[PDB]
Structures are given as structure tokens and as C-alpha cells.
Design a protein around this nucleic acid. Structure first.
Length: 56
RNA sequence: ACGAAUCUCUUUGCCUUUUGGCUUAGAUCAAGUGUAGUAUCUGUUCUUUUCAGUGUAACAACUGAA
């Protein structure tokens, strides 16, 4: 049961694709060894930064 | 003195959930009064000269002059 993207669940999907898309880049930049806690932390910086953009 | 093992200690290094997501911050909402009375923290001043009176269980405290 793969559920299509519709009006109600649009912007949730937009979130999900954005978060993945950022982890891809930043993980492809860093040298190597440790990610996952670091992976989690980077995304919190993202969302915080978006909130800052809305509030100017 | 030296190859050199083990326990103790400092440092460098290593590090743990180093917040689960999303939207219109997702939205909205919040403290009674009066009369009498006690308890308990902190701050500030004094252990500093004699004698005479008031005072006190005794001090203390208060009141005068060298």
C-alpha cells in the first residue's frame, strides 16, 4: 500500500525530502568516521535556521 | 646506569540522546479580598576608657561629667 502524495500530506513530504537532501550533501563533505549523532545534530541546526529565517 | 615487566598519578587523544520531524511561534487560555498575630533568612551598627542614678534573677540596656 504505497500512498500517493495529496493535498493533506504534501508539506510533510516536502519536509522529509529536504532533510534527506541535506544529510546527503553534508555527509558527502565531511572526512569520514562518525555521523549518526552528528547526523541528528546537523538537522537541528537546519530547522533552527529556518525558524530564524521566518522571524527575520 | 641500563634492556625491562606490574600497580598508582597528571596530560594529550577518544568521547557518551550533543533535544525525534512537520504547519498559521501549529492554536488558545491563566494572579481573590479584609481584620488580628507569630515564625524564619539576609543586610547595617557594637565586645572599647572610670565612677553616680534608672534598670535586670544576674547581666545587658539607658541616663550624666574627666
Amino acid at each position: 500500500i504505497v500512498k500517493t502524495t495529496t493535498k493533506q500530506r504534501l508539506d510533510a513530504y516536502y519536509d522529509l525530502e529536504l532533510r534527506n537532501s541535506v544529510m546527503d550533501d553534508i555527509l558527502e563533505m565531511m572526512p569520514e568516521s562518525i555521523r549518526q549523532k552528528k547526523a541528528r545534530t546537523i538537522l537541528q541546526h537546519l530547522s533552527e535556521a529556518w525558524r530564524c529565517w521566518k522571524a527575520n
